[PDB]
């Protein structure tokens, strides 16, 4: 992976090529939008790191990704992949949420399609014709 | 939560689904206009109606959210454009009958033909055939009757339909708490809560009429000068102090005097600046021209073209059975994908129109940071002005020297520079009183200040004073010759052509102030000026 003209990110948080004699390593594999890539970093007060995957801020390994529009985007439409954009409370690091709960920002119960009742998961909507920062990147977070 | 974040959460699902469903429709709009097929027009109206119905749902669900509740400047203007009632404020069948009139007006104005008085087998539509007569023919009386023909065969058929049209649109406009449907037009430019650049609806009338008094001297320069040239081409047909005959104005209605260059050229033997003889010299293609445009954009500091532009566009005509409409239009579909349908040939005008439509793609790249409803122009006049900056600046021969088409040692005397710029003055200065008269007539008719038996009388008398055009055949009220024009008959506001032409030269001199061009303003190019890139880009990333 270090000697690879195939991955686009390579963000480790060169010496780690031989520094690795550590304990167990976690590999986080997922697919993002090409403009969402900024929010895959520590901090990042935005929709991806607040609601989809929050990252730790002090110790971290590596973050790598690469263009997968030919695989993970469909010309007639990849509406399969979703992402959280509404949640009462931002994520902490290592936290994972699968709750498909109808969002009501006022803390009240919510039965859609009534007022202020939305679904927390927008489809990606990736075609082969979309813009650059709008494709599916297979992200490997280490 | 506060209603502000409820208004944001309403737009949050909107700005990702209306991003989707507009790009659904605009893809289907693209693939029919580039592959003309009955299945593609089926799915274009399938996706276009599902887009409008999804727009129908989210407009009415925003009608539950009052605009006088939120102090956030962004979602105020978002919900304001959402919860406009529009045609929903009349009755259920009255606005449908009103749109049945728009169905029947637009049908027989596109179908309506004129037929020759000696050969009724030879019949002509608006384009081609009749506008070929009204822009190229030399006969006085053949152009005279054909001018009368387009105002008689479809002007009379538009008139009782235009009677019923202007009443129900005014009842539509007054039910949305406006003065008239001229005031519903004037409600477009109004902004509330933005200091310095506020704009009343009365501001639009008075600002157009103010700076038109700056236009009027140079127009009356052009008015008196083309009367002398047309007397020399039409001896004793045109009065020496009387106004221009309306069948001799180079076009169908009087908007452009550009086709008078055959009859109003001072020095017809001086050459014209044409560089297409050098385009084929180095064997250029459309891939050279759009890349040379892209190089001309990046020469001033603008970013390059997207990868998705080169993947998804279509800048040649696709030959056989895959049919494509060849009007050069910039197609902003969504999801960061920008494309242009243009049948680009090896042409100096296709060279300039390439910069024009990709100049709209420049503005598409810069509102892209904004959300979907601020992914627009601010008013209706900022799009075409942005596209025409690159048309004017890259048409100057100093750019044509640097590209290698025109030789760098070639001379540009002011005898050939005035004649080309007077040809452009027939276009730009010719359309400003025509537009000024056009809405001002429309203002008073929808207000009710012009009676129905004085519609056609005030129409042609305003051409006598504003446009300086006496009608050669008098028109009573059986005509609807303003509706003879395509904008009035089919629900267009025409004031945007005025304000764009104002703003594009407010922007050009401000660009030429940023370009620091040493010579004249009509010889000004923005080449290699990084301040001209920053000043242009800056006021382009704001959007609405």
PDB file of C-alpha atoms in Angstrom, chain B residues 195-434:
ATOM      1  CA  UNK B 195     -28.925  47.330   3.268  1.00  0.00           C
ATOM      2  CA  UNK B 196     -27.644  49.397   0.349  1.00  0.00           C
ATOM      3  CA  UNK B 197     -28.895  47.202  -2.506  1.00  0.00           C
ATOM      4  CA  UNK B 198     -32.597  47.175  -1.622  1.00  0.00           C
ATOM      5  CA  UNK B 199     -34.940  47.494  -4.561  1.00  0.00           C
ATOM      6  CA  UNK B 200     -38.573  48.540  -4.496  1.00  0.00           C
ATOM      7  CA  UNK B 201     -41.013  47.609  -7.235  1.00  0.00           C
ATOM      8  CA  UNK B 202     -41.255  51.309  -8.017  1.00  0.00           C
ATOM      9  CA  UNK B 203     -37.445  51.319  -8.172  1.00  0.00           C
ATOM     10  CA  UNK B 204     -37.479  49.166 -11.332  1.00  0.00           C
ATOM     11  CA  UNK B 205     -39.634  51.598 -13.318  1.00  0.00           C
ATOM     12  CA  UNK B 206     -37.679  54.673 -12.238  1.00  0.00           C
ATOM     13  CA  UNK B 207     -34.203  53.142 -12.650  1.00  0.00           C
ATOM     14  CA  UNK B 208     -34.936  51.873 -16.171  1.00  0.00           C
ATOM     15  CA  UNK B 209     -36.322  55.286 -17.134  1.00  0.00           C
ATOM     16  CA  UNK B 210     -33.408  57.177 -15.544  1.00  0.00           C
ATOM     17  CA  UNK B 211     -30.424  55.559 -17.243  1.00  0.00           C
ATOM     18  CA  UNK B 212     -32.355  55.234 -20.505  1.00  0.00           C
ATOM     19  CA  UNK B 213     -31.971  59.019 -20.650  1.00  0.00           C
ATOM     20  CA  UNK B 214     -28.238  58.266 -20.796  1.00  0.00           C
ATOM     21  CA  UNK B 215     -28.931  55.842 -23.665  1.00  0.00           C
ATOM     22  CA  UNK B 216     -31.210  58.266 -25.627  1.00  0.00           C
ATOM     23  CA  UNK B 217     -28.469  60.651 -26.966  1.00  0.00           C
ATOM     24  CA  UNK B 218     -26.332  57.911 -28.546  1.00  0.00           C
ATOM     25  CA  UNK B 219     -29.536  56.268 -29.765  1.00  0.00           C
ATOM     26  CA  UNK B 220     -30.637  59.535 -31.381  1.00  0.00           C
ATOM     27  CA  UNK B 221     -27.144  59.713 -32.856  1.00  0.00           C
ATOM     28  CA  UNK B 222     -27.846  56.281 -34.332  1.00  0.00           C
ATOM     29  CA  UNK B 223     -31.429  57.298 -35.178  1.00  0.00           C
ATOM     30  CA  UNK B 224     -30.453  60.315 -37.292  1.00  0.00           C
ATOM     31  CA  UNK B 225     -27.499  58.525 -38.903  1.00  0.00           C
ATOM     32  CA  UNK B 226     -29.339  55.443 -40.185  1.00  0.00           C
ATOM     33  CA  UNK B 227     -32.105  57.642 -41.596  1.00  0.00           C
ATOM     34  CA  UNK B 228     -29.534  59.289 -43.871  1.00  0.00           C
ATOM     35  CA  UNK B 229     -28.150  55.919 -44.987  1.00  0.00           C
ATOM     36  CA  UNK B 230     -31.603  54.428 -45.609  1.00  0.00           C
ATOM     37  CA  UNK B 231     -32.636  57.467 -47.666  1.00  0.00           C
ATOM     38  CA  UNK B 232     -29.628  56.718 -49.871  1.00  0.00           C
ATOM     39  CA  UNK B 233     -30.818  53.108 -50.253  1.00  0.00           C
ATOM     40  CA  UNK B 234     -34.572  53.858 -50.327  1.00  0.00           C
ATOM     41  CA  UNK B 235     -34.881  57.113 -52.324  1.00  0.00           C
ATOM     42  CA  UNK B 236     -38.099  59.002 -51.434  1.00  0.00           C
ATOM     43  CA  UNK B 237     -39.457  56.020 -49.456  1.00  0.00           C
ATOM     44  CA  UNK B 238     -38.375  57.251 -46.006  1.00  0.00           C
ATOM     45  CA  UNK B 239     -39.055  60.739 -44.668  1.00  0.00           C
ATOM     46  CA  UNK B 240     -35.892  62.748 -43.848  1.00  0.00           C
ATOM     47  CA  UNK B 241     -37.169  63.766 -40.392  1.00  0.00           C
ATOM     48  CA  UNK B 242     -39.907  61.170 -40.111  1.00  0.00           C
ATOM     49  CA  UNK B 243     -39.214  57.989 -38.228  1.00  0.00           C
ATOM     50  CA  UNK B 244     -38.151  54.639 -39.639  1.00  0.00           C
ATOM     51  CA  UNK B 245     -40.709  52.390 -41.362  1.00  0.00           C
ATOM     52  CA  UNK B 246     -41.263  49.281 -39.266  1.00  0.00           C
ATOM     53  CA  UNK B 247     -40.939  46.921 -42.246  1.00  0.00           C
ATOM     54  CA  UNK B 248     -37.388  48.191 -42.897  1.00  0.00           C
ATOM     55  CA  UNK B 249     -35.879  47.564 -39.446  1.00  0.00           C
ATOM     56  CA  UNK B 250     -33.848  44.491 -40.445  1.00  0.00           C
ATOM     57  CA  UNK B 251     -35.866  42.077 -38.293  1.00  0.00           C
ATOM     58  CA  UNK B 252     -39.452  41.010 -37.710  1.00  0.00           C
ATOM     59  CA  UNK B 253     -40.457  43.416 -34.933  1.00  0.00           C
ATOM     60  CA  UNK B 254     -37.792  46.135 -34.641  1.00  0.00           C
ATOM     61  CA  UNK B 255     -35.496  44.785 -31.924  1.00  0.00           C
ATOM     62  CA  UNK B 256     -32.197  44.497 -33.818  1.00  0.00           C
ATOM     63  CA  UNK B 257     -31.009  46.888 -36.514  1.00  0.00           C
ATOM     64  CA  UNK B 258     -28.078  44.546 -37.192  1.00  0.00           C
ATOM     65  CA  UNK B 259     -29.285  43.317 -40.598  1.00  0.00           C
ATOM     66  CA  UNK B 260     -29.143  46.905 -41.932  1.00  0.00           C
ATOM     67  CA  UNK B 261     -25.356  46.603 -42.386  1.00  0.00           C
ATOM     68  CA  UNK B 262     -25.857  45.840 -46.088  1.00  0.00           C
ATOM     69  CA  UNK B 263     -27.675  49.178 -46.454  1.00  0.00           C
ATOM     70  CA  UNK B 264     -26.065  51.337 -43.723  1.00  0.00           C
ATOM     71  CA  UNK B 265     -22.348  50.571 -44.084  1.00  0.00           C
ATOM     72  CA  UNK B 266     -20.321  53.791 -44.545  1.00  0.00           C
ATOM     73  CA  UNK B 267     -17.295  52.191 -46.233  1.00  0.00           C
ATOM     74  CA  UNK B 268     -18.426  48.869 -47.710  1.00  0.00           C
ATOM     75  CA  UNK B 269     -15.013  48.125 -49.244  1.00  0.00           C
ATOM     76  CA  UNK B 270     -12.986  48.016 -46.027  1.00  0.00           C
ATOM     77  CA  UNK B 271     -12.326  44.431 -44.834  1.00  0.00           C
ATOM     78  CA  UNK B 272     -13.942  42.622 -41.915  1.00  0.00           C
ATOM     79  CA  UNK B 273     -11.925  41.079 -39.084  1.00  0.00           C
ATOM     80  CA  UNK B 274     -12.284  37.353 -39.789  1.00  0.00           C
ATOM     81  CA  UNK B 275      -9.904  34.677 -38.508  1.00  0.00           C
ATOM     82  CA  UNK B 276     -11.587  31.463 -39.685  1.00  0.00           C
ATOM     83  CA  UNK B 277      -9.204  31.462 -42.662  1.00  0.00           C
ATOM     84  CA  UNK B 278      -6.441  30.732 -40.124  1.00  0.00           C
ATOM     85  CA  UNK B 279      -8.444  28.204 -38.083  1.00  0.00           C
ATOM     86  CA  UNK B 280      -8.225  25.624 -40.893  1.00  0.00           C
ATOM     87  CA  UNK B 281      -4.634  26.747 -41.607  1.00  0.00           C
ATOM     88  CA  UNK B 282      -3.450  24.876 -38.509  1.00  0.00           C
ATOM     89  CA  UNK B 283      -6.276  22.281 -38.873  1.00  0.00           C
ATOM     90  CA  UNK B 284      -8.190  23.141 -35.718  1.00  0.00           C
ATOM     91  CA  UNK B 285     -11.158  21.231 -34.337  1.00  0.00           C
ATOM     92  CA  UNK B 286     -13.785  21.827 -31.667  1.00  0.00           C
ATOM     93  CA  UNK B 287     -11.430  20.090 -29.235  1.00  0.00           C
ATOM     94  CA  UNK B 288      -8.930  22.874 -29.944  1.00  0.00           C
ATOM     95  CA  UNK B 289     -11.472  25.687 -29.528  1.00  0.00           C
ATOM     96  CA  UNK B 290     -12.959  24.591 -26.201  1.00  0.00           C
ATOM     97  CA  UNK B 291      -9.448  23.852 -24.921  1.00  0.00           C
ATOM     98  CA  UNK B 292      -8.285  27.262 -26.162  1.00  0.00           C
ATOM     99  CA  UNK B 293     -11.276  28.703 -24.315  1.00  0.00           C
ATOM    100  CA  UNK B 294     -10.256  26.678 -21.241  1.00  0.00           C
ATOM    101  CA  UNK B 295      -6.709  27.966 -21.669  1.00  0.00           C
ATOM    102  CA  UNK B 296      -8.142  31.474 -22.011  1.00  0.00           C
ATOM    103  CA  UNK B 297     -10.060  30.936 -18.769  1.00  0.00           C
ATOM    104  CA  UNK B 298      -7.000  29.631 -16.901  1.00  0.00           C
ATOM    105  CA  UNK B 299      -4.857  32.451 -18.318  1.00  0.00           C
ATOM    106  CA  UNK B 300      -6.681  34.921 -16.039  1.00  0.00           C
ATOM    107  CA  UNK B 301      -6.720  32.712 -12.929  1.00  0.00           C
ATOM    108  CA  UNK B 302      -9.973  30.782 -13.407  1.00  0.00           C
ATOM    109  CA  UNK B 303      -9.907  27.004 -12.814  1.00  0.00           C
ATOM    110  CA  UNK B 304      -9.850  24.495 -15.652  1.00  0.00           C
ATOM    111  CA  UNK B 305     -12.729  22.392 -16.944  1.00  0.00           C
ATOM    112  CA  UNK B 306     -13.983  19.412 -15.007  1.00  0.00           C
ATOM    113  CA  UNK B 307     -13.288  15.826 -15.965  1.00  0.00           C
ATOM    114  CA  UNK B 308     -17.060  15.324 -16.016  1.00  0.00           C
ATOM    115  CA  UNK B 309     -17.349  18.060 -18.640  1.00  0.00           C
ATOM    116  CA  UNK B 310     -15.157  16.185 -21.115  1.00  0.00           C
ATOM    117  CA  UNK B 311     -16.883  12.885 -20.293  1.00  0.00           C
ATOM    118  CA  UNK B 312     -20.501  13.932 -20.532  1.00  0.00           C
ATOM    119  CA  UNK B 313     -20.831  16.819 -22.981  1.00  0.00           C
ATOM    120  CA  UNK B 314     -21.523  16.810 -26.719  1.00  0.00           C
ATOM    121  CA  UNK B 315     -19.834  19.547 -28.742  1.00  0.00           C
ATOM    122  CA  UNK B 316     -20.378  18.086 -32.217  1.00  0.00           C
ATOM    123  CA  UNK B 317     -23.531  17.206 -34.097  1.00  0.00           C
ATOM    124  CA  UNK B 318     -24.018  13.422 -33.932  1.00  0.00           C
ATOM    125  CA  UNK B 319     -24.512  12.915 -37.676  1.00  0.00           C
ATOM    126  CA  UNK B 320     -27.136  10.238 -38.330  1.00  0.00           C
ATOM    127  CA  UNK B 321     -30.382   9.075 -36.616  1.00  0.00           C
ATOM    128  CA  UNK B 322     -29.294  10.343 -33.189  1.00  0.00           C
ATOM    129  CA  UNK B 323     -30.716  13.829 -33.680  1.00  0.00           C
ATOM    130  CA  UNK B 324     -29.615  16.811 -31.610  1.00  0.00           C
ATOM    131  CA  UNK B 325     -30.887  20.379 -31.522  1.00  0.00           C
ATOM    132  CA  UNK B 326     -27.964  22.592 -32.544  1.00  0.00           C
ATOM    133  CA  UNK B 327     -28.671  25.732 -30.532  1.00  0.00           C
ATOM    134  CA  UNK B 328     -25.644  26.500 -28.321  1.00  0.00           C
ATOM    135  CA  UNK B 329     -26.956  26.250 -24.754  1.00  0.00           C
ATOM    136  CA  UNK B 330     -25.145  25.667 -21.470  1.00  0.00           C
ATOM    137  CA  UNK B 331     -26.748  22.731 -19.669  1.00  0.00           C
ATOM    138  CA  UNK B 332     -26.452  22.809 -15.875  1.00  0.00           C
ATOM    139  CA  UNK B 333     -27.926  19.451 -14.883  1.00  0.00           C
ATOM    140  CA  UNK B 334     -26.771  19.134 -11.266  1.00  0.00           C
ATOM    141  CA  UNK B 335     -24.550  16.906  -9.108  1.00  0.00           C
ATOM    142  CA  UNK B 336     -21.510  18.925 -10.161  1.00  0.00           C
ATOM    143  CA  UNK B 337     -21.902  17.805 -13.787  1.00  0.00           C
ATOM    144  CA  UNK B 338     -21.721  20.649 -16.293  1.00  0.00           C
ATOM    145  CA  UNK B 339     -22.207  20.244 -20.026  1.00  0.00           C
ATOM    146  CA  UNK B 340     -23.035  22.127 -23.228  1.00  0.00           C
ATOM    147  CA  UNK B 341     -25.104  21.131 -26.248  1.00  0.00           C
ATOM    148  CA  UNK B 342     -23.558  22.969 -29.183  1.00  0.00           C
ATOM    149  CA  UNK B 343     -23.034  21.956 -32.811  1.00  0.00           C
ATOM    150  CA  UNK B 344     -19.589  23.531 -32.913  1.00  0.00           C
ATOM    151  CA  UNK B 345     -18.046  23.987 -36.351  1.00  0.00           C
ATOM    152  CA  UNK B 346     -14.755  25.557 -37.371  1.00  0.00           C
ATOM    153  CA  UNK B 347     -16.065  29.112 -37.082  1.00  0.00           C
ATOM    154  CA  UNK B 348     -15.059  32.451 -35.558  1.00  0.00           C
ATOM    155  CA  UNK B 349     -18.602  32.783 -34.197  1.00  0.00           C
ATOM    156  CA  UNK B 350     -18.536  29.242 -32.796  1.00  0.00           C
ATOM    157  CA  UNK B 351     -15.206  30.306 -31.281  1.00  0.00           C
ATOM    158  CA  UNK B 352     -16.919  33.202 -29.490  1.00  0.00           C
ATOM    159  CA  UNK B 353     -20.050  31.228 -28.586  1.00  0.00           C
ATOM    160  CA  UNK B 354     -17.799  28.540 -27.076  1.00  0.00           C
ATOM    161  CA  UNK B 355     -16.482  31.136 -24.623  1.00  0.00           C
ATOM    162  CA  UNK B 356     -20.073  32.314 -24.164  1.00  0.00           C
ATOM    163  CA  UNK B 357     -21.708  29.058 -23.093  1.00  0.00           C
ATOM    164  CA  UNK B 358     -18.679  27.893 -21.113  1.00  0.00           C
ATOM    165  CA  UNK B 359     -18.806  31.360 -19.574  1.00  0.00           C
ATOM    166  CA  UNK B 360     -22.155  30.248 -18.187  1.00  0.00           C
ATOM    167  CA  UNK B 361     -20.414  27.066 -16.984  1.00  0.00           C
ATOM    168  CA  UNK B 362     -18.016  29.400 -15.142  1.00  0.00           C
ATOM    169  CA  UNK B 363     -20.953  30.799 -13.176  1.00  0.00           C
ATOM    170  CA  UNK B 364     -22.253  27.255 -12.671  1.00  0.00           C
ATOM    171  CA  UNK B 365     -18.963  26.312 -10.990  1.00  0.00           C
ATOM    172  CA  UNK B 366     -19.170  29.251  -8.596  1.00  0.00           C
ATOM    173  CA  UNK B 367     -22.655  28.998  -7.123  1.00  0.00           C
ATOM    174  CA  UNK B 368     -21.869  25.300  -6.566  1.00  0.00           C
ATOM    175  CA  UNK B 369     -20.775  25.977  -2.978  1.00  0.00           C
ATOM    176  CA  UNK B 370     -24.259  27.341  -2.266  1.00  0.00           C
ATOM    177  CA  UNK B 371     -27.257  25.066  -1.573  1.00  0.00           C
ATOM    178  CA  UNK B 372     -29.643  24.048  -4.332  1.00  0.00           C
ATOM    179  CA  UNK B 373     -31.985  27.041  -4.186  1.00  0.00           C
ATOM    180  CA  UNK B 374     -29.061  29.466  -4.005  1.00  0.00           C
ATOM    181  CA  UNK B 375     -27.586  27.558  -6.963  1.00  0.00           C
ATOM    182  CA  UNK B 376     -29.079  30.189  -9.260  1.00  0.00           C
ATOM    183  CA  UNK B 377     -28.476  33.700 -10.455  1.00  0.00           C
ATOM    184  CA  UNK B 378     -29.444  36.467  -8.054  1.00  0.00           C
ATOM    185  CA  UNK B 379     -31.868  38.077 -10.476  1.00  0.00           C
ATOM    186  CA  UNK B 380     -32.805  37.055 -14.006  1.00  0.00           C
ATOM    187  CA  UNK B 381     -30.211  39.329 -15.648  1.00  0.00           C
ATOM    188  CA  UNK B 382     -26.905  38.036 -14.247  1.00  0.00           C
ATOM    189  CA  UNK B 383     -26.558  34.847 -16.327  1.00  0.00           C
ATOM    190  CA  UNK B 384     -26.360  36.222 -19.888  1.00  0.00           C
ATOM    191  CA  UNK B 385     -24.125  39.106 -18.779  1.00  0.00           C
ATOM    192  CA  UNK B 386     -21.541  36.664 -17.374  1.00  0.00           C
ATOM    193  CA  UNK B 387     -21.565  34.680 -20.619  1.00  0.00           C
ATOM    194  CA  UNK B 388     -21.081  37.813 -22.725  1.00  0.00           C
ATOM    195  CA  UNK B 389     -17.980  39.023 -20.853  1.00  0.00           C
ATOM    196  CA  UNK B 390     -15.893  36.350 -22.581  1.00  0.00           C
ATOM    197  CA  UNK B 391     -17.678  37.038 -25.865  1.00  0.00           C
ATOM    198  CA  UNK B 392     -16.644  40.708 -25.923  1.00  0.00           C
ATOM    199  CA  UNK B 393     -13.155  40.400 -24.413  1.00  0.00           C
ATOM    200  CA  UNK B 394     -11.984  37.462 -26.554  1.00  0.00           C
ATOM    201  CA  UNK B 395     -13.365  39.023 -29.752  1.00  0.00           C
ATOM    202  CA  UNK B 396     -10.863  41.886 -29.572  1.00  0.00           C
ATOM    203  CA  UNK B 397      -8.109  41.396 -32.196  1.00  0.00           C
ATOM    204  CA  UNK B 398      -5.303  41.572 -29.602  1.00  0.00           C
ATOM    205  CA  UNK B 399      -6.546  38.184 -28.415  1.00  0.00           C
ATOM    206  CA  UNK B 400      -6.699  37.212 -32.081  1.00  0.00           C
ATOM    207  CA  UNK B 401      -3.044  38.206 -32.464  1.00  0.00           C
ATOM    208  CA  UNK B 402      -1.954  36.225 -29.400  1.00  0.00           C
ATOM    209  CA  UNK B 403      -3.841  33.072 -30.419  1.00  0.00           C
ATOM    210  CA  UNK B 404      -1.985  33.020 -33.749  1.00  0.00           C
ATOM    211  CA  UNK B 405      -5.115  33.271 -35.900  1.00  0.00           C
ATOM    212  CA  UNK B 406      -4.741  36.944 -36.701  1.00  0.00           C
ATOM    213  CA  UNK B 407      -1.146  37.916 -37.397  1.00  0.00           C
ATOM    214  CA  UNK B 408       0.498  39.909 -34.566  1.00  0.00           C
ATOM    215  CA  UNK B 409       1.715  42.564 -37.044  1.00  0.00           C
ATOM    216  CA  UNK B 410      -1.778  43.146 -38.483  1.00  0.00           C
ATOM    217  CA  UNK B 411      -3.093  46.718 -38.385  1.00  0.00           C
ATOM    218  CA  UNK B 412      -6.390  47.748 -36.784  1.00  0.00           C
ATOM    219  CA  UNK B 413      -7.372  51.201 -38.034  1.00  0.00           C
ATOM    220  CA  UNK B 414     -10.355  53.007 -36.540  1.00  0.00           C
ATOM    221  CA  UNK B 415     -12.066  53.108 -39.948  1.00  0.00           C
ATOM    222  CA  UNK B 416     -12.586  49.348 -39.650  1.00  0.00           C
ATOM    223  CA  UNK B 417     -13.050  49.568 -35.862  1.00  0.00           C
ATOM    224  CA  UNK B 418     -15.920  52.083 -35.983  1.00  0.00           C
ATOM    225  CA  UNK B 419     -17.670  50.159 -38.794  1.00  0.00           C
ATOM    226  CA  UNK B 420     -17.623  46.936 -36.777  1.00  0.00           C
ATOM    227  CA  UNK B 421     -18.601  48.728 -33.566  1.00  0.00           C
ATOM    228  CA  UNK B 422     -21.374  50.610 -35.371  1.00  0.00           C
ATOM    229  CA  UNK B 423     -22.555  47.183 -36.535  1.00  0.00           C
ATOM    230  CA  UNK B 424     -22.566  46.209 -32.861  1.00  0.00           C
ATOM    231  CA  UNK B 425     -24.238  49.531 -32.034  1.00  0.00           C
ATOM    232  CA  UNK B 426     -27.077  48.480 -34.342  1.00  0.00           C
ATOM    233  CA  UNK B 427     -27.522  45.495 -32.003  1.00  0.00           C
ATOM    234  CA  UNK B 428     -26.944  46.840 -28.478  1.00  0.00           C
ATOM    235  CA  UNK B 429     -28.229  50.410 -28.861  1.00  0.00           C
ATOM    236  CA  UNK B 430     -31.002  49.192 -31.181  1.00  0.00           C
ATOM    237  CA  UNK B 431     -32.611  46.904 -28.589  1.00  0.00           C
ATOM    238  CA  UNK B 432     -32.583  49.239 -25.573  1.00  0.00           C
ATOM    239  CA  UNK B 433     -35.484  51.554 -26.631  1.00  0.00           C
ATOM    240  CA  UNK B 434     -37.332  48.528 -28.007  1.00  0.00           C
TER     241      UNK B 434
END
